[PDB]
Amino acid sequence: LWPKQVRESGMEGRIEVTDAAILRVISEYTREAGVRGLERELGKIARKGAKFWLEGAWEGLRTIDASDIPTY
Amino acid sequence: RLELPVIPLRNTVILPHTTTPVDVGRAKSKRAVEEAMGADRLIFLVAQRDPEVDDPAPDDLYTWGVQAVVKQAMRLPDGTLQVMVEARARAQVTDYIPGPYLRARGEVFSEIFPIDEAVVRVLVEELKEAFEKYVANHKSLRLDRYQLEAVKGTSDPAMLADTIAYHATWTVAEKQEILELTDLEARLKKVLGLLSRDLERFELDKRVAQRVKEQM
Amino acid sequence: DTNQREYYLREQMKAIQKELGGEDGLSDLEALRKKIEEVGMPEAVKTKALKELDRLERMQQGSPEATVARTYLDWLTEVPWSKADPEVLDINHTRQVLDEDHYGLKDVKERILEYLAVRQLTQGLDVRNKAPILVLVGPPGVGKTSLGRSIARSMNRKFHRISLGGVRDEAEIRGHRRTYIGAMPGKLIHAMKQVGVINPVILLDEIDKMSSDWRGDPASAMLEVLDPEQNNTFTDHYLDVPYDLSKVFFITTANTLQTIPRPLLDRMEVIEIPGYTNMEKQAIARQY
Amino acid sequence: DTNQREYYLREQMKAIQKELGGEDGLSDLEALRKKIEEVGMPEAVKTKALKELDRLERMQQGSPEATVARTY
Amino acid sequence: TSLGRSIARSMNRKFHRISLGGVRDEAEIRGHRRTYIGAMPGKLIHAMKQVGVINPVILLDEIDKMSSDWRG
Amino acid sequence: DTNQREYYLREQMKAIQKELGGEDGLSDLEALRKKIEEVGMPEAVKTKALKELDRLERMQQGSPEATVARTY
Amino acid sequence: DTNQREYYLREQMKAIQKELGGEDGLSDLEALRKKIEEVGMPEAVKTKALKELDRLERMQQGSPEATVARTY
Amino acid sequence: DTNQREYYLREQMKAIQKELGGEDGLSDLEALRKKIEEVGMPEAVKTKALKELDRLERMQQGSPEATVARTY
C-alpha cells in the first residue's frame, strides 16, 4: 500500500512510515473488510506530506510514527 | 535610359522583337503615353498588381521592367490610346519618383543575339516541344499555335521565352515577372516547370473525368 | 508543382462552393477549413479534419449537409487545441490571491492549498492525477463562483460555469449524430469552446440535481469524465477524436451529499462549503 | 437542366474527394486494408473479410460502407 | 401597454410592443437559418424596423410562456 | 416509365409552387443602396449592410442566398 | 380571374398530391393529432393531450408505461 | 417446368448476388434454394419452401427476410 501511496503523492525517499503507525491506522481510521479504507487514510497522509514539504523542507527523512497522527 | 513617363501595364503584354498594340485608356496614364511619345518616342513599361490605380506609384511598380521604343505614333484621347510600340531589349528599374510623373531609367535600346547556340537551341527545342504538347491539351482552351511556327528562325532564347511564356495563360502577373526578367535560363526553367504543373493537372483532370464516367 | 495543382483543386472547390450550398457562412466555413491548419490541433484532429474535408465540397443542396459541415468546422477550430495558460507553479502565490476573496475563512482554503500543494508537486515524469477533482457542496449563494474565480486568478487561468440542474440524458451530456443541422455536442464542448486554452477550469453546477429519468445515464458519461485518464479518452456523439481532457483542471458545485449518483461517489473528494457568519458577510458588504 | 448540372458537380465532389484513389480517397483505407492481408486468422472468418474486401474503398459523405467495415 | 406608451412619450421616444408567447425556437427570438429565402428574423427585429428610433422601447408580451421543443 | 413519371410529378409540384406570384422591379436595388448609406448605421450595422451591398447587385431575386439577403 | 388562376393552380396541386401515397395515407400520428382537435373538449384536455402527442415518438412501443400513456 | 424456372432463378440470382450486396447476403439464398427444388423432398417441404422461396432475393440488413428464409 504505502509504496503506492508515495507513488501517488510523489514523496519518494521523503517518507518514513513505521508500522506502529499502521497499527494505529487500522485500529483507529478504518474498520472495514478490505484494503480500500487503507488507501483512503494513507492518501490523507500522502497529501498532508506534500503540503508540509513544498512549504519548506525541514529534512530529507520524515519519520511518521504513532504520534504525528492528527496532523496528517 | 533617358527618363520617361512610365506606363503602368495591367492589360497589355508586349513582345521583344515584335510589335504589340498598347491599350491605355486610363486618364492619368494616357497623358504619360502622350508625353512619352513626345519623349523622342520612348516608352517605359513597368507592370503593377499592388492595388490598381492610374498613378505611377513607386509602391505599386516592381523592381523589374522592360523597354519600349515606339513604332507608330498615334494617340486617341477620346478613348483607349491606340499605339503600337516594340521592345528590342528588356530592362530593370533604377529610379523612383512619386508621380505623376514617375521619372525612371531603364536600359539601352539595341538588338540582342545569342553567343552560344548549342545548349541554347537544345533548351529552345525542349521548350518548343513542351509548348506543342501543351497546346494540344490547350485545344479546349483554344489558342492559335501558328504564331510560334512563323518565328522559328529567331534563335534568341529569352525572346522565345517571352513568346511561349506569353502564349500560355497561367497568371498574367507571373507573365509580367517573366516578361521583365533579365535572366533567360531562370525564365526558361520557370516556363518548363509551369508547363510541367499544367500538363500534370491536365492528366489529373483526365483521371477525375474517367473516374466520373465510371461512377456514372 | 503538385501542391500547386492540389491547392488549385482547393480553389476549384471554393469556386464551386461559393455557387451552391448554405453560403452565408460557407466562406466562414472556408476560413474554418483554413483555420484547421491555423488552430494548433493534433494530427488525429488534423486527420478527422481531413475526414470532414472529404465530407466537404458540398456540391449539392444548402439543406443541412453544408451547414452541419460548417458547424463541425466551427466546433473544430473553436474548441481550442494546443493553446494554454502559463500556470502558476506556486501555492504561495495562490494563497496570495486567496488573501482577497472573502478572506477565505481559513477552513477550506487550506484544503485547496493541500490539493494544490500535492499538485504543484506533480511527479512521475508527467502530470498524473490518480485523484479526484475535489467536488464542493453547500447552499448556492455562497462563494462557489467566487472561490473558483480566485483560484483561476491564482493560476492565471480563466473560470467558467456550465450547469447541470435538471439534466437527465447522456443525450444532454453527449450530443448526437451530425447528419442533420440542429445536431450539436452537449454542454461541455461548448464550455471548452468558450475559453481559448487547453488548461481551463470548468465549474459544474448543481450536479446532484441532474436526475436521470429517460434513456441513457448522464452519470455514466460523467464518471467517465471524472476518471483522470478516461477524460483523456472522452468523446461525445458529435465528434470523432476524443479531446484531451487530461490537461484540463476541473471543479464541481452541488448541494446534496446524498442524491449524488453512486459511481460518482468514488473519484470524488467532498469539501462541504460553509454557510457563512454574519461578521464575514458584513465585511464583504462593507468592502467589496 | 439544373438538377442535371447538380448531379454533374456532386460527381465532381466525390471524384475530387477521391483524387486518384489508388492512394485512396483518404489514405487510411489501405492502412486498414493491410490488416486483412497481414493478420493470421481462420479461413471462413478471413473469407468473410475477403468478401467485405470488395465493398471497400468508399468515403464518408459518399458510401458509408468502410465506415462500418474498417471497425468490423 | 398603457404604461409603455406613456413611457415612450415620457421618455420622448417611440413605443413598440410584440409578443413572445408560445415561442419554442429561434424563429421569433432569432432569425431562421440563412440557407433559404423565407428565413425571416425574430419578432424583435420586426419591432426594431417597424419603429424608427435608435432608442426605442420594446415590450415583450407573455414571456412566461416561452419554452423548448426544437431549436433549443 | 412510372418512376420517371413520379419524378416529373414532383418537379411539376415545384413548377406550380413557384407560380401565383412573381417579383419584378429593379429600382429597389437603387433604393436600398441609398438607404444603407441613407440610414446611418454603426460600423457593426453599416459593415453588415455593406456586406449585403457587396453581395447583391448580381442577383437579388435569383439565387436563394441573395434573396434572403435582400429581405435581410 | 385571380380566384380562377389560383383554382387552376390548386387543381393541379391536388392532381399531384393525389398520386403521392395519399398524403402519407393519413398516417397514425397525423390522425391521433386530429382526433383531439376533432372533438371539442375543455381546453386543458387539449393541452395535456397535445403534450402526450409530443411525449411519444421516442420509445419503441415495447415500453410498458409510455404505451399506457398512448392508451390515455 | 416450375422446377426448371426455379433453377433459372436459382442460377441467375446467385450469378448476380455473387457480385453484389448478395455477398453481404453471402449468396446462400440461391445456395439453399437448392434445398427447395434440388433435393427429393415432400410436398410439405415444397409448400413451405415456396412460401419462403418468395422470401428469397431480399435485403440483407434491418430484420432480414432472406437470412431467416435460407435458415428456414
Author numbering:
A (entry chain D): 506 to 577
B (entry chain B): 2 to 217
C (entry chain E): 218 to 505
D (entry chain D), F (entry chain F), G (entry chain A), H (entry chain C): 218 to 289
E (entry chain F): 362 to 433
Give sentences copied directly from the paper behind this entry.
The Lon protease is a AAA+ protein found in prokaryotes, archaea, and eukaryotic organelles. Lon is known to form a homohexamer; each protomer is composed of multiple domains, including an N-terminal substrate-binding globular domain (NGD), a long-helix domain (LH), a three-helix bundle (3H), a AAA+ ATPase module, and a protease domain.
To provide a comparative context, we also examined wild-type MtaLon in two states: without any nucleotide (MtaLon-Apo) and incubated with 5 mM ADP (MtaLon:ADP). Unexpectedly, both MtaLon-Y224S:ATPγS and wild-type MtaLon, whether with ADP or lacking nucleotide, predominantly formed left-handed spiral pentamers or spiral hexamers, rather than closed-ring hexamers. Interestingly, the 3H subdomain of Ac6* occupies the axial cavity of the spiral complex and binds to the ATPase domains of the protomers 1–5, effectively blocking the accessibility of the pore loops and forming an inactive structure.
